């Protein structure tokens, strides 16, 4: 709404192509190794109706990043 997480999420969805999971190397190609590695580690094992190899659930990153320890 007044944030930019909802926007990033929509952009991520479009980044992967209406997929709740994105390729580890693909996001590493978009985001710098530093952020990409953190994202890869902060992501969760895809989880869905189809096991996507080399791709993990990105929604978990936004969820982990959504929860603040002082908000």
């Amino acid at each position: 709404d007044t944030d930019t997480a909802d926007q990033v999420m929509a952009s991520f969805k479009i980044l992967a192509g209406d997929k709740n999971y994105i390729t580890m190397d693909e996001l590493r190609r978009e985001l710098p190794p530093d952020q990409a590695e953190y994202c890869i580690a902060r992501m969760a094992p895809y989880t869905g109706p189809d096991s996507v190899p080399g791709a993990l659930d990105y929604m978990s990153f936004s969820t982990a990043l959504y929860g603040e320890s002082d908000l």
């Binding site: 944030d3 930019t4 990033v8 952009s11 991520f12 980044l15 978009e30 985001l31 952020q35 002082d70």
Partner: peptide, 23 residues
């Protein structure tokens, strides 16, 4: 595009820092 999406990510991270410094 891919470049715009990444731009938004960086901007969010960027403004997030300032937001936290404020409250």
């Amino acid at each position: 595009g891919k470049f715009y999406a990444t731009f938004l990510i960086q901007e969010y991270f960027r403004k997030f820092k300032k937001r936290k410094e404020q409250g």
